[model samples]
Target: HKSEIAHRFNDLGEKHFKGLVLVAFSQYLQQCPFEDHVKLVNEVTEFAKKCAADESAENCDKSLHTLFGDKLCTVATLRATYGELADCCEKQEPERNECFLTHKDDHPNLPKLKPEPDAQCAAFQEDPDKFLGKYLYEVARRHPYFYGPELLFHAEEYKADFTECCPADDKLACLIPKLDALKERILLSSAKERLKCSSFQNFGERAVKAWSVARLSQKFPKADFAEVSKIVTDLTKVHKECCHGDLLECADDRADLAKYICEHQDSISGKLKACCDKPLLQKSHCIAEVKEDDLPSDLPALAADFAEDKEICKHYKDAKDVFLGTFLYEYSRRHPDYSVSLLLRIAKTYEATLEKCCAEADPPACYRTVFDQFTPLVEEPKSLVKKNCDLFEEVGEYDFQNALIVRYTKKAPQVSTPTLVEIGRTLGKVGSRCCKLPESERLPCSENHLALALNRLCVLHEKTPVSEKITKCCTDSLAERRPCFSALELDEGYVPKEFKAETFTFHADICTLPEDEKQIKKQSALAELVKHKPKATKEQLKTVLGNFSAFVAKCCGAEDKEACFAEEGPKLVASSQLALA
Candidate 1:
């Protein structure tokens, strides 16, 4: 049997080192004869001692270090393995002498097992692996009494050896089953032993796997259907609390494992209903299935609903003003042509709602909200006012008139008489009031008014028909009563009046003027006045005639040029040659 076990170990070793080690340890432990178990323990302890001594020796250390390199086993593990063998030897001894002898002294060849200085297990006066081994050894020491036979001895040996041989690569493969077995033993053991053995390795992994196995067993009736529902439910609660509501960290790989088990909960329910006389397992299975299926959809909604209810709009009144203000601003930008009626309706609704909701406090900030919306429009007239009256209100009475005058002046020729008159009348009203202010204020007003008046007159002059009706209107408005004059002046033929000849003392140096020359000179003066008549004022024409008479006297070489210009003395000069022919 031992040789067959060795062969099996070698076969498994090809695939995995941890498996081979586990098999070798289990087979060796199990094959020991009942009588020689004590001797076997001694021999193993001596072998470990020899190995530890060789590791410490210079030549041997170099050889072993070359073979293992950085892969040297942890000192804690080596000590624990030696301690296990020694413990087994002491426990199997029938006589106190044999037990004392076996445990008398620490092995001489072995290096003293001092813990690493920074070791977490130093306070316990043992290496961490030895501490765990010591616990298992105590269980093995009690196995004879607990089982009432030696059958469990081999099983315990196999368990210890399997644990001892756990390699780094295949740790889970070796650990999971042993961990589960230890937990089962704890659960079923006598009360004293249960308390003593409860600190077995990987309790969390064992409990989680056990729960998963029990859950899966319901689907396949051949599996161990250990009723662990209550235990698992309690464990989940404790796990959540311990991990501060994170079950993922507590369950580790078992979380996915448990999920897989619960996926077939419907099948499990059917099996429990058919095979079990009581329907408790079936009911549990049904509840679990329902919970699992519902969680994916229902739980998120529940959490959202809870958040909404907790954060209800308790301060809605405080926020109302800001909300309405934002709405008003958006509405104004989006709908500039929004009617007064619409604004009034919205304002009223806001006012009423705010009054009802926040009456105890200040009036709902409805006024502020409305004001915010209105402020930008009123502040910048150029942006909001599109029409005349709208612009007038925005830019103020004075500015509007000025702006109107400028606009009308630039495009007046294109406008009609009636439109010009209306615009002028409107401007006059603004100007009359503007002119009465003090100089500091009146300067701008006066300039604007003058400009408007001038522009209006120019427009009227250009567009008004030269008819009696328009002329009459102009004449009626002037301070002095004057004849109605057409804006267009017609040229009248030159009129010459007869004048009396006056005798004047003349200097002998005077040259005699020809009749044609005198006539030509007179004709030229008459033509000059007629050509400029349309643009000339009445006073300007009078001055031109006075200057012409002085020139005629100078031509005649009169002593007193002014004296020669007696109103009645000069004969009128006329050009009648064309008429005569």
Candidate 2:
């Protein structure tokens, strides 16, 4: 019942402040000391009298429980004497910050402030200044974004103001005049240091301002809104701590930072692609429009131009993505069905490697170097399957790491590496064979593949099939299947001499390049392969590739073999002499 009595506790919450709560409290009340019991009884009885309950002392308990119901309690106290001082940062919130400092030693259990449970009211006797700072520090600390904001918004001189405020009188009386001086001195600084539309580690100033003002509950805000999660609250410190001044020096130095850098790339790349939907000129303003709400009109129309119109182009390059969001994006892209929490736990096992050794100078080239040192071997299962293998618990949430770990040790030794090189390859293989299997018993089916050696793994000994990471490459119809096949050779450390592009139906589907771009992709791939193996050259690889495709077409009975014969009759003969052997 939403009664006058129910409205009495509306300060806590409707569901939590119930008449039956006293019923719930009755057992606990039995143990209450006489004065506490008498005080509670007097408070409840007078309140019941106001609500038209009988006061004859005959039916006491029935009146309250009949009006109340059970529900969850999420407490918030609004009646406060704190906002003006905290906002100024000149004078601190005396009730929350100063009150605690004043009476903290007096009360043993750390008395709470006004309407607040425990102390300020109980011990300080409704004293306003008693535990003010307790509320100030504790509340802001949870959502450190604000716990650290206003005072923390990466500026200058504000630090100097905060320096003497507390250490002097400690009650903040010294800052009463300092607030005016702070007002005179504070200009809010240049916008350059504050804005982070494109930061990787931090959510940027715009996001910070949005959430800071929205002030969504640190404990539980609605999920659909941007300000509603702990990830949002916690990430405020990322940019604040990660970068050195402006440049991404952290990733340049460490491994987990490096992984985070690349992971940030993965997150923004999708958003960047979305940003590019409007073309170069409007791309910068698009994020601004995206920030407040939806895009204003059709794709081309941005909500409005940036106030600094010249900054538009650079904004596209600098937009910062939330780290947790980026991690979720990367994890989801790799393993579509697994919960992000599981992947997060698994990722933590090897985060140091991600921060320390991962590549930064050149990514695609980095892809080659990182995978070069990694070689899958058959060895002792328990010896290798310790911390990393703990991740294997959720087999369905499993990707290449889990697949490779168990692949080698379960029945064989183990299979995969440090960065994404192994994870991608494993997902390509295991996900292809296992995830594509009947979903009914896929994890078990995946296990069978893991339990095999490299020679037996999803094997086709008579003819080497395209590797998973490679074959699944080029999710689009590339001008030519360059990166697709390049990943295979780069990954396996060998060019498949028997390779016949014409023999595979997928080659026809994906190799849509207009010959020149195809050749470029092909040459780049060959050059990379040539770097790994100096014995091989672009020309030699080319003739071999031509010969394989030509001969395989002629031998495999391709519909175009007659055309191939017409195009290169003698080269086919030379290719046969060099290849069939």
Candidate 3:
């Protein structure tokens, strides 16, 4: 079977042979040590040259085994999966990656027995580097077409998590969560590979390259237009080569990208700087999974020229991916807070609309009514956010956090005490920071920050069990999650305690403390008013907190302090309760 694979490679045309050589070297590089990347690439290149003039399949097989044996490659690994994917080699360049991806499921060598959680933890504890090498090999062999940089990225993340988690008490408990999180991450990488390959296969390279440019440009809007375009062109060339089975070239291009980004780190997103801070090769993989930063506010909004007019068909026919890709680029960068799934929904809507319109006798007229629907699609979320920020500004920060805790606890009573407290704290921090921003900047700041905090909870809840309503709300698209949670019914069966105002018994003692500590006591009393009277409007609640503050100041400094406090404390509480109610 091994010789049969080498014979197949020997018989391939020039383009296919060059492609296969890189693919073969990529697999070996994953199995071999990282220090050997240059050696392996050179060896594989030389081996391909030897096969060029030497017509004998016998010599081809000998060279193949010689290369494989020197790399310390496993025979079992080669014989089973390599033969299984051998048919993919018959396909042309662009279709090769997709073929490998489609055939990966049929390979029988997967889920190869690894140690149990406890036993694995023991092995990891023994020699972290050795275990990591074995772990990378097993994963790489299982998914042969998976990029080497991404594989290295996954291994490094595992090592970091292991170092942090394994040394603590209850080793399995910490280790298992890391393992489960790693499982989810592995699923994400496979999903990305399959999606990209299928896009290249069905949509062709132009559309795929255009889409990649739009995505990266949207994320790093501050970079020079020419600079970003140049980077995208270089990166797409790598994708063209690598996705079609040129792993050695892919690795080289990846390092170039990493080097360029690190050198120009200040001009790009701040989120990537941490990735660039790592050692050279490790940093290449670090940037693989970095998240996009929020878009800067001053950039001009991008309008969709193709979506609204008859020019859509003309441009789409001229360059299908470019037109559609530009439309998505314009639409999505304007709404950076939108989730990928939500952006996808918008993109799909345009495609569906175009599909419907272009097939009709008069395409222009058919699209006239269809394009109007996009207004509400974008406006509804903005409207929801505006309403939320208005209420937040109405009630000051101290009462706002308490109001959030009261509403959330009443609505999701099933949520644990710890989680409820964390949510309340999240609201408090968001309110304190965002509410202070200029009015022009405040709403976007509040919306994006709140979404990020809640999405972290969503990722956490996605794995562990939660109430059905909570789970559905969390699982909804990012655009819908805030509104979905808001739409949840108030828990009718749960009863809140009756409202009562606070007496200023501690007001005199608070005045004795330092200024910072004294203000905290004053703020605590204000928050308590909201807990007591949950129905109080913004103005009513502020009136009571303001009045309570003035009363405290007057009584604290009086000549007969005790007598003054005794006389005013009950009257103050009574009036505040009446006003709040």
**Number of clashes recorded per candidate:** 1, 36, 0
TM-score of each: 0.15, 0.19, 0.46
Better of 1 and 2 by TM-score: 2
Give the local distance difference test score of model 1: 0.33
Candidate 2 lDDT over residue span 207-274, tens digit each: 44333223212111112323233334434444443221211111112222223323443332333335
TM-score of 2: 0.19
Model 1 lDDT tens row, 233-345: 44444333222211112222222323434554454333333323323223322333331111111113221321233221344445654344333333322322332223333
TM-score of 3: 0.46
How far out, in Å, is residue 319 in model 3?
Answer: 8.7
lDDT of 2 at 83: 27
Predicted structure with the largest lDDT when compared to the true one: 3
Candidate lDDT (C-alpha), each: 0.33, 0.30, 0.59
With a 3 Å backbone cut-off (N, CA, C), the pairs that clash in candidate 1 are: 500-569
- After superposing all C-alphas onto the true structure, candidate 3 shows an RMSD in angstroms of 15.7
lDDT of 3 by residue, 1-581 (tens): 33433444444433334434433554533333433443554465565565555645454554333444344332334445356555545555445445544544313334444336667778888876656665565665555556655666677677787778777787777777777778657644644554454446545765556556556765766655556666777777767655555554565667778888878877877888789878755787666656666667676534335545557677667877556666666665665555443455567677778787888788777776665667666576567656656767787765676566656654565555445555665666677777677654555566655655565455445435557788777654434566677787555554444544343455467667766456556555544554455566757866876787788788788977777777888887888778977
